Structure formats: C-alpha cells, structure tokens
Structure 1
Amino acid sequence: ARIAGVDIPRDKRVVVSLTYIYGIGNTTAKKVLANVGVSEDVRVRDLTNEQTDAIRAEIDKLKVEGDLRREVNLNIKRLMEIGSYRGIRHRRGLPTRGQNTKNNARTRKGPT
C-alpha cells in the first residue's frame, strides 16, 4: 500500500511516479530503473509483478523512506537545543547566510 512504503499513483508514467514517494527526486528514479533495466512503459504504467518486486528490492537499499523526516527533524532538534543562533533563528526562520530581512517573510509566514 501502495508499492513502496506508501504513495504510488495509478495510470501514470513509471519514472515520474517513482519520484512521488517522499525522498526520491529525479536522479534516484532513473538510476533505480537503470539497475533493473526498464523504460517509460508507457504513459499508463502496466508493470509486471516481477518488475514490481525488483524495484521494491532496489529501493530498500536507500535511506529514503516515509522516515527521512525523522532524521531531518532530529538534526534541527540537535541544532535548536545547544547554542544556537541558527537554532534560535530556526525558531523564527533564517538561513545559512541571512538575507537582510525586511522582505524575507513573504515565503515563510505571509507577513502582511
């Protein structure tokens, strides 16, 4: 449910649909399919029960899960609870370089 962790759609193209799962970008899908040896197939996906297992195996060699968030969450957790200016402004959203915030809220909170 559906095929890898969760979140696979039906009646789409394969390589695009494999990006959908949380943590798989675009290079991941192409390299995974490379290690099986497949292609689009086609615009409504019609995979075989064996190909499904092949991809289910090759995917389980990746830290990408429905659990990648836990690592990121704990990382920003270690951040926000030691110093931490980065963690402090991570209680209020500022980056690895800062941008002189007198517009830099229109993407984080909708300031107006």
Structure 2
Amino acid sequence: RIAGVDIPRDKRVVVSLTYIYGIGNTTAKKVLANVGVSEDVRVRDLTNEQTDAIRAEIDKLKVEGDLRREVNLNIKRLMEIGSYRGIRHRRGLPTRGQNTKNNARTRKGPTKTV
C-alpha cells in the first residue's frame, strides 16, 4: 500500500501511517505537512495523487525492512565486539543499567519460579 504494509483503511491518515515501522506520531505529522494532506481525512478517501505523494514522501525515510536491518546490525555489532551491552543483549538482561534483582521481566521473559 505505502511501504509494503496495508495501512488501516478506516483510520485517519496520521494514525494509519503509524502502522508503518519507522513512522511514529510525530513523523506522520511531518510527512503529511510536507505532502499537503489534511490530517483528518480517512485514508480510504486518499486519492491516487495523495497516496503517491505520501509514498514519495515516505520513500525518503528509512522504514520497515530497511530500518529493521539497521537496528539489528547495531545490536549485532555490540555482541561481536564483546561489549558489556552486547553481553546484556545476548544473555537477555537489561542493557541500560537497570537493576535485575527484581523486575527485568521484559528482558528476562516469564517468571521461572523453579
């Protein structure tokens, strides 16, 4: 549809774009302001001219598979050089100084009470 993702047809454009990996709320507003598409129109109402303008606008940004490879390469590098952060990534522990005696469940996964 836009970057290889069928954005929700019923939602307003600002939000529908957010379903693209690499587009958040602020970035969606920027691309619509550049193209000149009102933020309140449902994307089902987008005309081929408006959609292509959005696609042209989005093609400038790094999104979806391009972004995912970029971030994974960063983490890959941290692991390869053997940095402290890389080990945190590889062992599934918080990487930004958070204490692990408690919590850290997002990184660790579900509790293993054993």
With the shorter chain as reference, the TM-score category is: 0.7 to 0.9
Gaps of 5+ in 1: none
Gaps of 5+ in 2: none
Which is worse superposed, 27-36 or 59-68? Answer: 59-68
- Cα distance change, pair 100–10 in 1 and its aligned pair in 2 (3 A): same
Equivalent residues, number: 111
Partners of 2:108 and 2:6 lie apart in 1 by 28
Contact 1:14 1:45 in 2 (8 A): no
Tell me the residue number matched to 1:13: 12
- Deviation per CA, 1:30-55: give whole Å up to 9, x if none: 11011111213434631111001111
TM-score between the two structures when normalised by the length of structure 2 = 0.83
Contact 2:94 2:100 in 1 (8 A): no
Contact 1:41 1:47 in 2 (8 A): no
Which is worse superposed, 99-108 or 44-53? Answer: 99-108
TM-score between the two structures when normalised by the length of structure 1 = 0.84
What RMSD in Å do the two structures reach over aligned CA positions?
2.0
Tell me the residue number matched to 1:55: 54
Partners of 1:87 and 1:33 lie apart in 2 by 38
Tell me the residue number matched to 2:107: 108
Which is worse superposed, 4-13 or 31-40? Answer: 4-13
- Deviation per CA, 1:79-110: give whole Å up to 9, x if none: 10112221112112344541221113322234
Which is worse superposed, 92-101 or 64-73? Answer: 92-101
- Deviation per CA, 1:45-81: give whole Å up to 9, x if none: 3111100111110111112233211011111111101
Which is worse superposed, 42-51 or 27-36? Answer: 42-51
Contact 2:79 2:85 in 1 (8 A): yes
Percent sequence identity over aligned pairs: 99
Partners of 1:106 and 1:3 lie apart in 2 by 35
